[PDB]
């Protein structure tokens, strides 16, 4: 079995290997990459996402989110307070202000220490889930707006044609902006490209050990667990590396820099934080190997998780027994 310790693997495809996206995911899996739940892909030196980032300031962040924490430094939840709209140029100025900017630090490990010590005492503002793309239309390789759709994959594998669409999302971050512990909708893959700015630190649990994370989360967030049998779908809970280590939970960590892709694999729980002002683009995708994970994915039916239109068909076709209850939680 390849990669039996479930380490995060880093890949350096050549420009020739960068042509066929599906083939390269399958290659990474042949080397055991999925066992980690996360892989890094460094694009060939010849590749670029677009020519420059000099003209993005007028993109609108319609609903910036202030991420307010509750709990203790290593075990906390966050809620999202809606703020008034602002442009990317306004948000960048805000991220660089004395109130929000990255503190002085020695290296990524020192910054990670400071994040876990101090995150809860601040409320950073995140631009999330903004439909759109920063890939140039002429970028033919690994263009996250031109991937094969999840509806076409389900139709190819299973023969059933379904409604729905699959488009990318932009994220504008600042110091301390935080992504809570989660798997993707329907335990899909994700791919994330860091277009510009400061790094993103990731934590990930191997898919084979995801239920160990879920059991710890039920212990640490006991009221939330009584409220919902899949409350990590709410995307509000944080647990630090120190707490994970104290409780014997297998995990790994890595820092993504501008110009790098990350892939999350089906049922790979992940969480992380941004180092400073940045912009990322991400989308979900599927492969034939995903179908069995989609069929077994947990679901929130309490009403909190609320998701896209396109998830309806996935539940309806892959999980017909759960469909009625889940749809009630959607309405
Ligand atoms: O970058 C972010 O805030 C969150 N992204 C992801 O969870 C992802 O790409 O799957
Ligand atoms: Mg613009
Ligand atoms: Ni994710
Ligand atoms: Zn729920």
UniProtKB/Swiss-Prot annotation:
Highest taxon listed in the record's lineage: Eukaryota
Record's catalysed reaction(s): N(6),N(6),N(6)-trimethyl-L-lysyl(9)-[histone H3] + 2 2-oxoglutarate + 2 O2 = N(6)-methyl-L-lysyl(9)-[histone H3] + 2 formaldehyde + 2 succinate + 2 CO2
GO MF annotation terms: chromatin DNA binding; damaged DNA binding; histone demethylase activity; histone H3K9 demethylase activity; histone H3K9me2/H3K9me3 demethylase activity; metal ion binding
The protein's Enzyme Commission number: 1.14.11.66
Every JmjN domain range: 8-50
Residues annotated to bind 2-oxoglutarate: 126, 192, 200, 235
Location in or out of the cell: Nucleus
Domain JmjC stretches: 136-302
Keywords carried by this UniProt record: ADP-ribosylation, Chromatin regulator, Dioxygenase, Iron, Metal-binding, Nucleus, Oxidoreductase, Transcription, Transcription regulation, Ubl conjugation, Zinc
EC supergroup of this enzyme: oxidoreductase
UniProt PTM: Ubiquitinated via 'Lys-63'-linked ubiquitin chains. Deubiquitinated by USP14 with the help of TRIM14 leading to stabilization.
Positions contributing to Zn(2+) binding: 228, 234, 300, 302
Positions of post-translational PolyADP-ribosyl glutamic acid modification: 16-17
Signal peptide: none
Any one annotated GO CC term: blood microparticle
Summary of the function given for this chain in its UniProt record: Histone demethylase that specifically demethylates 'Lys-9' of histone H3, thereby playing a central role in histone code. Does not demethylate histone H3 'Lys-4', H3 'Lys-27', H3 'Lys-36' nor H4 'Lys-20'. Demethylates both di- and trimethylated H3 'Lys-9' residue, while it has no activity on monomethylated residues. Demethylation of Lys residue generates formaldehyde and succinate.
Name of protein: Lysine-specific demethylase 4D
Organism: Homo sapiens
Residues of the full protein shown: 11 to 341 of 523
């Amino acid at each position: 079995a390849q990669n039996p310790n479930c380490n995060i693997m880093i890949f350096h495809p050549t420009k020739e290997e960068f042509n066929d996206f599906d083939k390269y995911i399958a290659y990474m899996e042949s080397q055991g990459a999925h066992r980690a739940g996360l892989a890094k892909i460094i694009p060939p030196k010849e590749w670029k996402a677009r020519e420059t980032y000099d003209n993005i300031s007028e993109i609108l962040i319609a609903t910036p989110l202030q991420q307010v924490a509750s709990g203790r430094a290593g075990v906390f939840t966050q809620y999202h307070k809606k703020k008034k709209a602002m442009t990317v140029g306004e948000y960048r100025h805000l991220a660089n202000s004395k109130k929000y900017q990255t503190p002085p630090h020695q290296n990524f490990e020192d910054l990670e220490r400071k994040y876990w010590k101090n995150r809860i005492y601040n409320s950073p503002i995140y631009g999330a889930d903004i439909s759109g793309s920063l890939f140039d239309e002429n970028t033919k390789q690994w263009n996250l707006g031109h991937l094969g759709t999840i509806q076409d994959l389900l139709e190819k594998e299973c023969g059933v044609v379904i409604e729905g669409v699959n488009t990318p999302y932009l994220y504008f971050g600042m110091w301390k902006t935080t992504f809570a512990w989660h798997t993707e909708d329907m335990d899909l893959y994700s791919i994330n490209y860091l277009h510009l700015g400061e790094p993103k630190t990731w934590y990930v649990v191997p898919p084979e050990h995801g239920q160990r994370l879920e059991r710890l989360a039920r212990e640490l967030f006991p009221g939330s667990s009584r409220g919902c049998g899949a409350f990590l779908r709410h995307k509000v809970a944080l647990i630090s590396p120190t707490v994970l280590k104290e409780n014997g939970i297998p995990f790994n960590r890595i820092t993504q820099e501008a110009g790098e892709f990350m892939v999350t694999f089906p049922y790979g729980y992940h969480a992380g934080f941004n180092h400073g002002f940045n912009c990322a683009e991400a989308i979900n995708f599927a492969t034939p190997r995903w179908i069995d994970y989609g069929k077994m994915a947990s679901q929130c039916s309490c009403g909190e998780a609320r998701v896209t239109f396109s998830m309806d068909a996935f539940v309806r076709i892959l999980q017909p027994e759960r469909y009625d209850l889940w749809k009630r939680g959607q309405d």
